[PDB]
């Protein structure tokens, strides 16, 4: 008869050590700072939330009055 065991070895990338180096961010995220940080330019909050990956982090730093840089092709 017919045959097809289909497992392939599973064994990803060696575990890396902390995945970071920009995250993926939606809209809603830029709005959700923006709005808890009217002082803040839209733009900028998009880049730390893409460092930071979390809206609540940027919140905190923005709070402490942390660096908040452009994002890339904004300079």
Wanted: charged content about 20%; glycine content about 12%; cysteine-free.
């Amino acid at each position: 008869g017919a045959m097809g065991p289909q497992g392939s070895t599973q064994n990803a990338l060696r575990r890396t050590g902390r995945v970071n180096g920009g995250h993926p961010v939606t809209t809603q995220m830029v709005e959700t700072v923006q709005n808890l940080a009217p002082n803040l330019h839209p733009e900028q909050i998009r880049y730390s939330l893409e460092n930071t990956g979390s809206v609540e982090e940027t919140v905190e730093r923005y709070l402490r009055g942390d660096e908040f840089s452009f994002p890339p092709g904004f300079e």
